[PDB]
Amino acid sequence: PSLMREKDRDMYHCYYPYLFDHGDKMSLYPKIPENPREWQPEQLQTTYDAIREDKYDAFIRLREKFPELYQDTRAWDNPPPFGEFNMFYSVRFGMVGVKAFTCKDYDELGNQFDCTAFWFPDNQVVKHSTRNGEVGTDKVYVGAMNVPVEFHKPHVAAFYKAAGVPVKHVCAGFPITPDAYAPVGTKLDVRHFKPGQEVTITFQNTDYGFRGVMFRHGFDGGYVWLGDSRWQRRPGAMGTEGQKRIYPGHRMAGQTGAAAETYQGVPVWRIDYKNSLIYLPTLLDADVGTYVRFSDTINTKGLTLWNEHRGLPAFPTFIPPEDEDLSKLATDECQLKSPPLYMY
Amino acid sequence: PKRKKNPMQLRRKVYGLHFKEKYLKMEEWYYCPLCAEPKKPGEWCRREDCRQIKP
Amino acid sequence: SKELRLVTHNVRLRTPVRDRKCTLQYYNPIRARFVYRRDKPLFDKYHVT
Amino acid sequence: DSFKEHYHRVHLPRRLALQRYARQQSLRNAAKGNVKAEEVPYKYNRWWVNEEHEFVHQYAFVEDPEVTKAKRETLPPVTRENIWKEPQQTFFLPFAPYVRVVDYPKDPDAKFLKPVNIPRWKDYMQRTKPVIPRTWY
Amino acid sequence: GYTRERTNRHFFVARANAFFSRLPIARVQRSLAMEAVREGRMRPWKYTKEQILGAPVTCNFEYNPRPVRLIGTVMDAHTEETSIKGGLKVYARNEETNMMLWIPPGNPKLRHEVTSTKGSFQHYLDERDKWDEAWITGRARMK
Amino acid sequence: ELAKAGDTDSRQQLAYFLHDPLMVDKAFDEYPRRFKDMNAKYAMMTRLKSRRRTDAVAMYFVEYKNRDMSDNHKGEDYSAGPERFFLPPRIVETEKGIQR
RNA sequence: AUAUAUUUAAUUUUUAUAAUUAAUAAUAAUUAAUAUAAGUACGCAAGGAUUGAUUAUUGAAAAAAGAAAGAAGAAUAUAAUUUA
RNA sequence: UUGUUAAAACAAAUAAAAUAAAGUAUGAAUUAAUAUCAAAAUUUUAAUAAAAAUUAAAAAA
Numbered sequence A: 001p002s003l004m005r006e007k008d009r010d011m012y013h014c015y016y017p018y019l020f021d022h023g024d025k026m027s028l029y030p031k032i033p034e035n036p037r038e039w040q041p042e043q044l045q046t047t048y049d050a051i052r053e054d055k056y057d058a059f060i061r062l063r064e065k066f067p068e069l070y071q072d073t074r075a076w077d078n079p080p081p082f083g084e085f086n087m088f089y090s091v092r093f094g095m096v097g098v099k100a101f102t103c104k105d106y107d108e109l110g111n112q113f114d115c116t117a118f119w120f121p122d123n124q125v126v127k128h129s130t131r132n133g134e135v136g137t138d139k140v141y142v143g144a145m146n147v148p149v150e151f152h153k154p155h156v157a158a159f160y161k162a163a164g165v166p167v168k169h170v171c172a173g174f175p176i177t178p179d180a181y182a183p184v185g186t187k188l189d190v191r192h193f194k195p196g197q198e199v200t201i202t203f204q205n206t207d208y209g210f211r212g213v214m215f216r217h218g219f220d221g222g223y224v225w226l227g228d229s230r231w232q233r234r235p236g237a238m239g240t241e242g243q244k245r246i247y248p249g250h251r252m253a254g255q256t257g258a259a260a261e262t263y264q265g266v267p268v269w270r271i272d273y274k275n276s277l278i279y280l281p282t283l284l285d286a287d288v289g290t291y292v293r294f295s296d297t298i299n300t301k302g303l304t305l306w307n308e309h310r311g312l313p314a315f316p317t318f319i320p321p322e323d324e325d326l327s328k329l330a331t332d333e334c335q336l337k338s339p340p341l342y343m344y
Numbered sequence B: 001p002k003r004k005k006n007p008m009q010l011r012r013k014v015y016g017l018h019f020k021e022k023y024l025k026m027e028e029w030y031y032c033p034l035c036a037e038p039k040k041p042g043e044w045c046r047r048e049d050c051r052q053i054k055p
Numbered sequence C: 001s002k003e004l005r006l007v008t009h010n011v012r013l014r015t016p017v018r019d020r021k022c023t024l025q026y027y028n029p030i031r032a033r034f035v036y037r038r039d040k041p042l043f044d045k046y047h048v049t
Numbered sequence D: 001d002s003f004k005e006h007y008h009r010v011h012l013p014r015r016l017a018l019q020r021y022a023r024q025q026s027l028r029n030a031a032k033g034n035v036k037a038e039e040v041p042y043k044y045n046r047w048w049v050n051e052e053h054e055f056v057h058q059y060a061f062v063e064d065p066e067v068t069k070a071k072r073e074t075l076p077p078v079t080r081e082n083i084w085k086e087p088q089q090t091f092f093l094p095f096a097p098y099v100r101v102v103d104y105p106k107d108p109d110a111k112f113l114k115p116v117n118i119p120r121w122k123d124y125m126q127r128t129k130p131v132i133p134r135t136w137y
Numbered sequence E: 001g002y003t004r005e006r007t008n009r010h011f012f013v014a015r016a017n018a019f020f021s022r023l024p025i026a027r028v029q030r031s032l033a034m035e036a037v038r039e040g041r042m043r044p045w046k047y048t049k050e051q052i053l054g055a056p057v058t059c060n061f062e063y064n065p066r067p068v069r070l071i072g073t074v075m076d077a078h079t080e081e082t083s084i085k086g087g088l089k090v091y092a093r094n095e096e097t098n099m100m101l102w103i104p105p106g107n108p109k110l111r112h113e114v115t116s117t118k119g120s121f122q123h124y125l126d127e128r129d130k131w132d133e134a135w136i137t138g139r140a141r142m143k
Numbered sequence F: 001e002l003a004k005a006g007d008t009d010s011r012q013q014l015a016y017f018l019h020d021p022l023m024v025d026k027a028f029d030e031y032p033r034r035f036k037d038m039n040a041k042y043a044m045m046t047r048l049k050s051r052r053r054t055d056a057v058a059m060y061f062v063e064y065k066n067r068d069m070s071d072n073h074k075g076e077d078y079s080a081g082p083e084r085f086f087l088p089p090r091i092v093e094t095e096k097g098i099q100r
Numbered sequence G: 001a002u003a004u005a006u007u008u009a010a011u012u013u014u015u016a017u018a019a020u021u022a023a024u025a026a027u028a029a030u031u032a033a034u035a036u037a038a039g040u041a042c043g044c045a046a047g048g049a050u051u052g053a054u055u056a057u058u059g060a061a062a063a064a065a066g067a068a069a070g071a072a073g074a075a076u077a078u079a080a081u082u083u084a
Numbered sequence H: 001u002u003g004u005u006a007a008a009a010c011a012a013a014u015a016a017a018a019u020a021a022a023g024u025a026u027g028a029a030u031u032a033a034u035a036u037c038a039a040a041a042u043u044u045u046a047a048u049a050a051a052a053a054u055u056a057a058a059a060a061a
Ligand SMILES: [Mg+2]
Pocket: G013
């Protein structure tokens, strides 16, 4: 972004009337030293300056008289209170889904998208955790896939007992801002996501076991070389270094797959809020049944995801109305498709 | 370049988990309620009683 | 100093038997997989759910 | 154990102890029977003009413990029908579209007859950020 | 120096193949197929492989200005009933130009209609021999 | 499953796949009455605790479930082999009167 | 055209839970051409502008706590598809 | 993929799939100066210096 040195924060560079602290009440003049001896020999203690007084007075008059012309200048005071969704500060926790199956869809322009459908069985806000109460060090754990008591291990069933939330199979933590909390035990409906929304997903790809160096890196594994030794560009003298050891990171044969793979910024295709299904046009590598985790993409192309031009999120979390009954509502009625998009 | 290894290098293998879990490890066993023999849970006897019901 | 520790030894004369306590009723990861495993072809006359 | 690793390993408990000592001053107030949250001075000087004569806006955000407790305890209100129904836009529309055609000028090729309210190509290309007064998109 | 390739994290290693039973996935497939049918991107079909194999078909690919039409002979049908999977193998010959296409159903810019569910295995064999001879001639002229 | 089907093509296939057509006929004669009242998992495998000496490999005893309800084998003892390997298998005293 | 040591690639088997600390500027020197920018300044004419957004590679980067001699399948991808 | 012939066949050769070649017992031989052997970088001394010095910190199977 635009470089702005802290030393350039003088009143001759401020866009609004620079206000000095001056104890409890803001003032338009630097704090005059209470002890007169502290007055530096060339420091000009200003008590009343007609220039600044007139400028500030005209500014306040115009702001109070023409609210429509000076609406954008209102952010100088009465800032947005804490708790409301913010475009650059409010991040919300994602969800935990299960890769259900794969299919293919078509848009109205004619493009074919090989999509995969994930299923969100029972998303419930299980826990809150902050470390020593610092800033931005708080996160929300969300649990999924309710199970009976005879399923989990004793030491995890003990935690679920201590929490009181119904015992879930999996539990993933999302780091969020304090104004995006949700009470423990809150059910998360899939409509928490929007169809025209970019999502970042994390999963575990399939396991292939020990594979050859050819199969691991493809054509890249055959030729692996790196030399940081000095070499003479011109025949003037003689001097070089011997590459004694092998540099760390050498591409060899080993474990393949079974790792934490993260896709960043995939758009949602469609949402079914009766069976709790989400469709993504990207074919994944994981198996069927891998507990993927979905989170909101922060920003792409220097543009925030949640803004007035694209849309407002379901902050903090989508809560359905009372008179809505998913049992009475049919399956075909519970379909939300994203607006068209072309990628070629 | 190969050379004789001191007794300390011969005793480094027992520090790893591969040596401990292979040779020196006990069994979880109980008495077959139908044969009165030591039996591991999961493997049964040839007798007709031990095949119909798992002791 | 360490001369006291050198001159004075400490020993366990006869430790109790190394017989393992009953661990069948504790949690066991190898037996955990069989708790929800289909065992229809394992029984003939005494099928239990 | 590297130099930085040892330094952090020996200093991190000391950092936590220093933070605890700092919060002890805050707990001094609630100890006397007057539980008062920490107050932060709101800074009105956050809109600047840089050396190259362009606008910069600093972002300062505060956290309210009472609002945090309220969001922890009370459930959020019902989500808006239009908010959850209307899908989010995929492509970001430009700040100034170049229409290239206006029905007002009789001769469309007349460059002097096009109305001024239609944005220009220079704005269509350079206007990728909001204006100086308005900060948000 | 050192890195780790595998992760024994519980959230990553846990699976849900046991709990996949409470999801009517086949019903979701049928619902998607029925939505496509009601939108008109596809039309339901109930034929068997030997019945449809060898039946003439006409496919129009919509394209401004002129949608391209193509009359061919169905060589293989991948599905016997309507579904989101689908799949048809058509073979069409223009003037001195043979082509073998795999038409997927449900494409809005693609309308394929088989002129008759009934098929003639004799004409199917004729088209298959023509296609194989063309392919062999092409390969022989290449190599 | 082939015996429950009992088709001529199924019998031809089983006779192709098996070594003994006499055993093919024995199966097709005895298995329908034996497994009329069963759906699946007809055989039964039991892992024996005793391993083979030469390979230290686990052994498994695989036998059909419905032995005593309807079959040519009935009331036979498999806990131990006979006196000789060419003698008929042991028979429980409860069902010694049955004839093969 | 000999089994070695240092160094590397992995693994030490469900760990409910990533990283405020080693990767000490940057995954491209925070890009970046491109239709539309322009039949337009500049040029007698011929010809010929600076230029940055949607078309692209631009998220730059390490998931280390619980009881362990079956196949981590009772195996023909259903956590028993009825079962004597 | 190449080459030969004729208006598809043969020969070469590798890189994808598939097949096999144990986790059981039996068990040598090359080699062997050696501290529970000196992870690395810098500088230097009579030829690789694994010889010395300075930074730095290199776990176990
Ligand atoms: Mg473990």
